[PDB]
Write a protein that binds this ligand. Sequence first.
Ligand SMILES: [K+]
Ligand SMILES: [Zn+2]
Ligand SMILES: [Zn+2]
Length: 230
Amino acid sequence: TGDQRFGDLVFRQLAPNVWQHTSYLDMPGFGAVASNGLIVRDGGRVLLVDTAWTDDQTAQILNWIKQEINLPVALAVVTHAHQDKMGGMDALHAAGIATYANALSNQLAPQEGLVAAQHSLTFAANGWVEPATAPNFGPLKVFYPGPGHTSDNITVGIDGTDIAFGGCLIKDSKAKSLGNLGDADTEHYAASARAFGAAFPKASMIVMSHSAPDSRAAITHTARMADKLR
Ligand SMILES: [K+]
Ligand SMILES: [Zn+2]
Ligand SMILES: [Zn+2]
């Protein structure tokens, strides 16, 4: 209740200027797998965090934004090189939206069959984005917590809100497993999850890629699950 639908996309307002977008991918015999990203209104422009699974779904996000917010989308940041986060890059570029990703995400994108972002983010030794690579990001605070779900995963806090986005690094606090595959770094995952928590220590709403928003318990639960794999 309260969620909005546009085509195959679902939108949930999380704060006066933040919405979660959800798109679905069918796994035959398994049903639809959800993927979440964020939409942020910053003054007279919109900033996008992650695409949908496909170009067509990403176009649905852009059309919902035009219809319900009616402000130009200035830039998009994508949080790693998997289809649920970068599958719609072509639709962003066609719309004239400037796209940003971790340099490593852009390097990985071709071998994954994905389109790289136009701009590469780089990071200081303490994990915070180098500001020259993230110009005019407004309230978006971009942090690289270390290798976890993937080597390239990045995370984003929204200044002025209680919201931080853990991407696929953080799992639901009720998760029964981490879902780590070959590209997860299971030696460092627990520390990376805890580093995300420490980078956004006041965030009380933790948005993640594959479950509904949770409390900080998602961070501590994820780190505990990851402790078991070291
Ligand atoms: K591994
Ligand atoms: Zn992923
Ligand atoms: Zn994912």
